[PDB]
A and B are shown apart, each in its own frame.
Chain A
Amino acid sequence: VSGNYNYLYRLFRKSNLKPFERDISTEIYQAGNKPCNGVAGFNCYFPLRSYGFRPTYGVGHQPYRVVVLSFELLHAPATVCGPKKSTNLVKNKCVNF
């Protein structure tokens, strides 16, 4: 409650990103024609805002946590694979093992 202003999200950039790329700069945007010289104001906007989360929000505005997995087999032949499990062992019986 009262606002949790830690999480930011960029909403100004020159051109869209590249897949799996990362950009963390904090250079002041420039939309107009006159160079900014690093001062906010007219046509010189800060590039970072913050999600102000509160418990009294509706669905679609409450903070969601997202995780993504991504595999890639550069060339490994025996890396991390799946796991396995049990199946009661017996003896003195013709069995398929």
Chain B
Amino acid sequence: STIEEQAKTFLDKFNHEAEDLFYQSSLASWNYNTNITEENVQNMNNAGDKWSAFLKEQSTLAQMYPLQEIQNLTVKLQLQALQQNGSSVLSEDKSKRLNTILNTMSTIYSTGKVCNPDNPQECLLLEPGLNEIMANSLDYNERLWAWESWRSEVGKQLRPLYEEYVVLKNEMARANHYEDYGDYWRGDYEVNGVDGYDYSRGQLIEDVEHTFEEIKPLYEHLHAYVRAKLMNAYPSYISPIGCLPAHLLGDMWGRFWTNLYSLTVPFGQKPNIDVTDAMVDQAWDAQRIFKEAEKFFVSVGLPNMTQGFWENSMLTDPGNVQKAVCHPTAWDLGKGDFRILMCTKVTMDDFLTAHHEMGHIQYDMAYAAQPFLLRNGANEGFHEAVGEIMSLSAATPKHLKSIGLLSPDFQEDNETEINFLLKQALTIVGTLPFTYMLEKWRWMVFKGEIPKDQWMKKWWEMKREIVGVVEPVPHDETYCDPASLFHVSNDYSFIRYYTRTLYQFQFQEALCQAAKHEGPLHKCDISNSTEAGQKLFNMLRLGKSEPWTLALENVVGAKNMNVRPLLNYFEPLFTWLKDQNKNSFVGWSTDWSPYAD
């Protein structure tokens, strides 16, 4: 009864019950996901309902213990995570209104239908075909149509709903001593009073705007190259001092330039590394690939699979007609019962996805000792970060020719290396300007700086200034372009895909500087080492029990995200791009327009 002994003794009970219930819920869910029937939806909805009701009751009960009389750090962190009101601080009818606006937004996004002006009877959804038209077509007219349509029919309906959504979320967040909603998102990177490891909610914006400054020397050259290359497929449509038209990037919103590899390959007659026929000519099943992944993981010094994962998991899609959503996922039903749900085919891409998923499996195996409320990554970003380095280290030619899938006399050269590096940088450094731009735009519109009659003009001037792309058609203020992105119209945070891109290469360099590697970083492997495994595992097992700025400094040695490893990873590509642009004009002028000529 030491004013705190009450917190501990509460916490225990909670712990137990929580864990148990959660498990019930989760088994239920895995079920429905692996065997789609009509009754299983009911078997899982009530389990989720009971879990949610229990958690909200415990949250309403935890309030009775003040948060300044606690002295131990871990119990304070657990209470601070549980004591969160979340929603339901609003007026009751406004809560239902918020649920309605959210669900209506999600539905209007999901079931969008756009139809041709030449044939309005049968037409296209978003997922089947629209992405294919925007990715694989090659005529300017069809791309411009597919681009303007989706923003003229799904951008116009969403604005009068997003307007109310903003103010409702702001009034929600403003009851928990917060000043807007964006702060309620940045609050994930917050650390209070640990004598030096503190990280104020504000300094996240400072880091982001301070690390985006060092990327531009590389992004500018990449933009110049991609532009001078796109000036071949569509002759006399781009200006050599202008920006790019949004409907030429490779998808609906311009998030990944990966589909531009067909037009901008450096050496179009030297094929890259690809183990796809060598696999099937060796009769590899879904079992063999996972055995290879586990062998690689155990080679570095991590434990085996739990021997309950080989009988329960579903590695190959069920033969008969058994509807199960084929989207890879790593389940941690808790209680040490880990599973992997994915419809593996015999392709090297699935061979890399297996590694990327067993990464999450290992990361979940590590921290299974912490209290139940601390079973996550250090923040939202570390999870996929620690996941992706396995795929980045398993795709190098060394690890391939050491497993029996490449001819021993396969000799790699600098041409194939530049090819691979551009294929990588079309995805890694390509999405960063878009990500930072969209997140800054959302923070701005939430804090109230941008008046609600200047949304689209500000968004497009930002697309002109930062990322270097220009709209093809004018858009007045009956539109809303950002509401046409999945992570926006569904109330999903969108800054993790910018911190992950940095944490990735920081982890890569920090780790395989212990494997005593000597060459460029893009050939670096973490196999056969034991110091690397220990350095990684001394962070994998913390969970949330320590501030993330300590989880970093125990791996790389710094107390923040630094972009230098990224540039050090791309240095060869940068040396090449500095030569292939001796005659073009780097950068872009925000005056050019595709219609004002």
Listed in ascending order, the chain A residues whose CB lies under 8 Å from chain B are 11-12, 29, 31-33, 42-43, 45, 49, 52, 56-61
Contacts and interface: CB of A to CB of B under 8 A. Distances in A.
A60 B568 CA distance: 44
B64 A49 contact: no
Contacts of B1: 31-33
Contact of A31 (B5, B308, B333): B5
B6 A61 contact: no
Interface in B289-348: 306-308, 312, 333, 335-338
Interface stretch (B8-16, B460-468, B548-556): B8-16
Contacts of A33: 1
Interface in B5-61: 5-6, 9-10, 12-13, 16, 20, 27, 61
A2 B160 CA distance: 48
Nearest to B312: A56
Nearest to B17: A49
B341 to A, nearest CB: 14
A59 B304 CA distance: 13
A42 B9 CA distance: 11
Nearest to B27: A56
A49 B16 contact: yes
Given A42-B61, A52-B20, A59-B308, A31 B336 contact: no
Given A11-B12, A42-B61, A45-B13, A56 B337 contact: yes
B308 A42 contact: no
Interface centre among A31, A32, A42 (most CB of B within 10 A): A31
A42 B64 contact: yes
Contacts of A12: 9
Contacts of A59: 306-308, 336
Contacts of A42: 61, 64
A52 B287 CA distance: 32
B13 A56 contact: no
Given A12-B9, A33-B1, A42-B64, A57 B336 contact: yes
A60 B336 contact: yes
Contacts of A32: 1, 6
Nearest to A30: B1
25 contacts: A11-B16, A12-B9, A29-B9, A31-B1, A31-B5, A31-B10, A32-B1, A33-B1, A42-B61, A42-B64, A49-B16, A52-B20, A56-B308, A56-B337, A57-B308, A57-B335, A57-B336, A58-B306, A58-B308, A58-B336, A59-B306, A59-B307, A59-B308, A59-B336, A61-B335
Contacts of A58: 306, 308, 335-338
A33 B10 CA distance: 14
Contacts of B336: 57-61
A43 B6 contact: yes
Given A42-B61, A49-B16, A59-B307, A31 B9 contact: yes
Contacts of A11: 12, 16
User: Which 6 pairs of residues, A with B, have the shortest CB-CB distance?
Assistant: A58-B336, A31-B9, A58-B308, A61-B335, A58-B306, A33-B1
Nearest to A51: B20
A43 B5 CA distance: 11
A45 B308 contact: no
A16 to B, nearest CB: 15
Contacts of A31: 1, 5-6, 9-10
B4 to A, nearest CB: 11
A11 B12 CA distance: 9
A85 to B, nearest CB: 40
B198 to A, nearest CB: 33
Contacts of B64: 42
